[PDB]
Amino acid sequence: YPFWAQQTYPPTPREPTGRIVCANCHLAAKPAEVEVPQSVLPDTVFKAVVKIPYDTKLQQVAADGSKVGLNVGAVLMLPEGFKIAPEERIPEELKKEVGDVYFQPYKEGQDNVLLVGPLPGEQYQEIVFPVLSPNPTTDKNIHFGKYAIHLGANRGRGQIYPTGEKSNNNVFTASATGTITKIAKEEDEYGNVKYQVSIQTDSGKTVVDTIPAGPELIVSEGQAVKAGEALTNNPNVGGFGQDDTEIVLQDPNRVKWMIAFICLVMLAQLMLILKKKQVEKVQAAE
Amino acid sequence: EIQALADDVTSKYVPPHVNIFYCLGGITLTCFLIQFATGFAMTFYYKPTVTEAYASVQYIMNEVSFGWLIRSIHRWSASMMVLMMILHVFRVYLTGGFKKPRELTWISGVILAVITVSFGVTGYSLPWDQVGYWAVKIVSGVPEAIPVVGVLISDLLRGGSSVGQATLTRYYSAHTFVLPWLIAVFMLLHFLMIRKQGISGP
Amino acid sequence: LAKGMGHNYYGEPAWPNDLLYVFPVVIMGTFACIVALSVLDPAMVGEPANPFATPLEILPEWYLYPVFQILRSLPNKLLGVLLMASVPLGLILVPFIENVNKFQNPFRRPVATTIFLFGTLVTIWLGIGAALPLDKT
Amino acid sequence: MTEEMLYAALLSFGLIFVGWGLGVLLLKIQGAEKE
């Protein structure tokens, strides 16, 4: 889960390289988008979508396996200074009515750094982010230009646990270079129902292992030699992608001037054609 | 007032022709004088050293009456000239210039392109970015996979054994001192030679 | 207009001067943009507050893709190298080769054009990186 | 990473005619070529 990150590497989730802790555990392999406007203005509430693929057609296992509902989570680095829009503003509900969930910071304080407790599911695949823009004049500690924006979005069950041991959405391997002569699949009374196994490796010490409930299966005996490697089946569908970006804040009196400058060129490169040939009926006189 | 002087007169010595594309050549160049300036303009504030550099660029953007501006331009103008240039090639091949008497103003030109491209690779890693860093910590290895002292050459880029501070200073001195002179030279050759013309139509 | 005295081979017909007070029209007009573009899309610093480990990307110079592509593109060999260095050198040898046409350019003899309107269709085909849709726009 | 710049592409490319036209249009006014 998002939180999980700050429960181990809380100073920040973004690794020095460019990846977020998410994969140092719950590892997946799906797409992900995080697009927002080219330029946003200071002291302004604006958009920020976080699309999350996979056709809703999907339906993963669950904690107990029972093929069911799917869930979507994430994390995001907004630019230093950028915070979550103020209730009052958030111009009309036209905004409000899209993203209505809990956005908590990471380390206590970082408002530009936001996680999303609320994991809507096959509901909020847009996970919109109402975000306000800082004012770098009310605070000289805030500067302009482009600024980075990074994101690491998840989904599907974990493959690794914060406890420190294998999850469900994944595979359960083994250890034995020799044809496994049997099995051990069964069940349990109440909250449990295990599916053990019995390798062989008669080649010396006949070793075996313990695969749990969850993953389906495949073939059986007469072989299954190889070298005692992978398991029977893998359920994982975990989805974790990642997209980086950047947005610009613009000093209007800085866009004006640049524009006020055009019109000069706009006129200049004109009078410059105005004269010239547009007044050469001179040599075109003899 | 007008004084004889060292002669002077209608230095210009021959008419043009009938065409429009042709332009980018000068255009490409233009953007240069934008880089020579912007560029230079920064030799006053850039700190090509391990410790600083990044912490120093923050200084140009941060404040400095218009840093962001000069820089930004330089950045665009740069990656812009390199565009204007490429088209300049089209305009050419698309026509000629690579034939009998200019059997070189084209070739020299070629060189002009290596230098140009080379300007980036260097400057392009100066900022101390992670992108700017590594992507020239990778192009510094290009020359290692070589026979003889072809290997004992790649060093002439990085200075250090791997990427020692050196890698920077070599680059810098290059981007600001070396190349900024060759390109000059070859541009001159490119032009000097260019005492010719074209257009094959009615 | 075409001349009579001098009467050479590859010379200068007409129009003269007065374009240098439009070159400035060029020049200026050819400046403005690098300006505006900057503004609307300035440049920036970055996470390298004191940088060091293998980034996720490394957007090598924004043009040296082809030459780059290639470098990687093909499994080792100085072939990667060579072939790329065959973009500069290999080229310098053009005026020598496609100089067949004693007169009318290689547009007449498309045999140059095509390979061009191609040795440039591949070229773009090398400005190709990231992880987007091929069968999706 | 396509969409965004992808429109800026054909974007500009169009403007190439956008002006080119006018350039000429300003001609059917002061003495260029016919039609």
Binding site: S39, A284 | - | A14 | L11
Partner: peptide, 27 residues
Amino acid sequence: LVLGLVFATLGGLFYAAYQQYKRPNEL
């Protein structure tokens, strides 16, 4: 305000080019 005239500035600016279109002279 100028959320849109942000670049509308740059497109409505290739004008320069547009000047260099009124290029001609016989002489």
